[PDB]
Amino acid sequence: MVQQKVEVRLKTGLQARPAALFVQEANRFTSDVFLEKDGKKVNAKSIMGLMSLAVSTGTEVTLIAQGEDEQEALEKLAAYVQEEVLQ
Amino acid sequence: MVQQKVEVRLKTGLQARPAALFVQEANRFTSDVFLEKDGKKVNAKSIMGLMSLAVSTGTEVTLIAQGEDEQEALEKLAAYVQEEVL
């Protein structure tokens, strides 16, 4: 057996469970909702879309909502992404 | 429309493609391979296992290889994980 400590330089993104829950919450709104970082935009109502964005825990991203319930969508989703929960 | 910058506090891990390619590379060897962080060890020839480790780009993890070709497996996978070109 041999071991070595290495630095992960491969791309990371949201894990499956957190992404699935994000989508469940985002689907409650009629607004289009996107997550954006470095000019790349993904659909927040898509599990595979959310997991395609390169992000690390602690990274800053832009949450965008457009539609009739955009304020409510932004409030609920910003809380979710930041591990907060408003209720 | 409205927007707001937020900090991602949700858990992250290797993306699907890099995880799948790591396994393709590991499949080249007969050795069993594992990745370990913070007491959590996963089978590195399992894509789901690989992706279940909480990691961020830049994080340090321990790569473990055991088998007949363990030394060569370790070298080649260490280079892959660190994105080093030969």
Contacts of A58 in chain B (CB under 8 A): 7-9, 56
d(CA A27, CA A30): 7
| Residues whose CB is less than 8 angstroms from the CB of residue B86 and which lie 6 or more positions away in sequence, other chains included | B79
CB neighbours of residue A29 within 10 Å: 20
d(CA B13, CA A11): 8
Asked if the C-beta of B6 comes within 8 angstroms of chain A's C-beta atoms, the answer is yes
Question: 């949700």: which residue's tokens?
Answer: B10
Contacts of A42 in chain B (CB under 8 A): none
Annotation: CATH topology of B1-86 = Histidine-containing Protein; Chain: A; (3.30.1340)
Asked if the C-beta of A87 comes within 8 angstroms of chain B's C-beta atoms, the answer is no
Q: Provide the shortest C-alpha distance from residue A46 to chain B (in Å).
A: 15
Q: Per-domain residue ranges for chain A?
A: 1-87
Asked if the C-beta of B86 comes within 8 angstroms of chain A's C-beta atoms, the answer is no
Q: What is the DSSP letter of B76?
A: H
d(CA A34, CA B74): 39
Contact A21, A80 (CB under 8 A): yes
| φ and ψ of B4, to 5 deg | -155, 140
Second CATH level (architecture) for the domain A1-87: 2-Layer Sandwich (3.30)
Q: How far is CA B73 from the centre of its chain?
A: 14
Asked if the C-beta of B14 comes within 8 angstroms of chain A's C-beta atoms, the answer is yes
Q: In what order do the strands lie in the sheet with A60-66?
A: A40-43, A32-37, A60-66, B2-7
Experimental method: X-ray
Q: Provide the shortest C-alpha distance from residue A47 to chain B (in Å).
A: 12
Contacts of A81 in chain B (CB under 8 A): 6-10
Secondary structure class of B10 (helix, strand, coil): coil
Asked if the C-beta of A86 comes within 8 angstroms of chain B's C-beta atoms, the answer is no
Asked if the C-beta of A12 comes within 8 angstroms of chain B's C-beta atoms, the answer is yes
